[PDB]
Amino acid sequence: DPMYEQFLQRIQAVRTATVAKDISADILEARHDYFGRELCRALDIEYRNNVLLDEIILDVYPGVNLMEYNVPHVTPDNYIWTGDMLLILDYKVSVGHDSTEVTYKKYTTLILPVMQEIGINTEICIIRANPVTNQISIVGEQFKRLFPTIPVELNFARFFELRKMLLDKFADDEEFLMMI
């Protein structure tokens, strides 16, 4: 596994709490990106990670004139354009709901106004995987209608092993326990 080994190499050679912080972060993001690929694979939809809203608009409505609109330059993880509806997908990997609400509020408030003016029928989807129990939670009714079952085989254990090593290595470093 080239990704585990590169994290491992970094956890082995890290000496300072600020570079440790970055490794923690990098882990949680690769754990997010891992779920995105597995999710998109199981549904057989295009995999993307951070698409600029302006780019999403132009794929779905080529004739648009961006300048005539105030488009917030958000980058949702992904989207599905069915031809009559746009599903804005963001991935999450969390035991709690707090990251989902924060993102749901952010995309509902910033993306939906401009999509209504442009006239594109849009829904905000947030798909979360609990990394401990592998259970998925979906916010988005049209998404649940298109994907009633999600047949993923998720295994987050290697990410947890790597971060636990990092947390143990810095268990007596007050500077790091604050940063996390």
Ligand X SMILES: COC(=O)/C(O)=C/C(=O)C1(Cc2ccc(Cl)cc2)CCN(Cc2ccccc2)CC1
Residue 68 per-residue DSSP state = G
> 50 vs 155, which CB is nearer to ligand X?
50
Give the residue with the Cβ less far from ligand X, 106 or 169.
Answer: 106
Pick one of 7, 21, 32, 115: the residue that binds ligand X (CB under 6 A): 32
The dihedrals phi and psi of 138, each to the nearest 5 degrees, come to -120, 125
Decide: is 79 part of the binding site for Mn ion (CB under 5 A): no
Q: Does 38 bind Mn ion (CB under 5 A)?
A: no
Amino acid type, 149: T
Q: Are strands 86-93 and 136-139 parallel, antiparallel or unpaired?
A: unpaired
Q: Which helix (H) or strand (E) holds 92?
A: strand 86-93
Residue 29 within binding range of ligand X, rule CB under 6 A:
yes
Q: Contact with ligand X (CB under 6 A): which of 28, 42, 64, 165?
A: 28
Q: Is 97 a known ligand-binding residue?
A: no
Q: Is residue 90 close enough to count as binding ligand X by CB under 6 A?
A: yes
Residue 22 in marked binding region: no
The nearer residue to ligand X, 121 or 133, going by C-beta atoms, is 133
Environment class of 39 (CB within 10 Å of its CB; exposed 0-12, middle 13-18, buried 19+):
buried
Instruction: Kindly give the residue spans of alpha helices, DSSP state H, lying in the chain.
Output: 2-13, 17-43, 53-60, 98-118, 141-146, 157-169, 174-179
Q: Is residue 91 marked as binding?
A: yes
2-13 and 157-169 helices cross at what angle (nearest 10)?
Answer: 10
Q: Which of residues 46-65 bind ligand X (CB under 6 A)?
A: 50
Q: Is 90 in the site for Mn ion (CB under 5 A)?
A: yes
Partner touching 29 among ligand X, Mn ion, none, CB below 5 to 8 Å by kind: ligand X
73 is in an annotated binding site: no
Angle value at C-alpha 153, between 148 and 155, nearest 5 degrees: 135
Residues that bind ligand X (CB under 6 A): 28-29, 32, 50, 75, 77, 90-92, 103
Q: Which residues bind Mn ion (CB under 5 A)?
A: 50, 77, 90-91
Binding site, annotated residues for Mn(2+):
32, 50, 77, 90-91
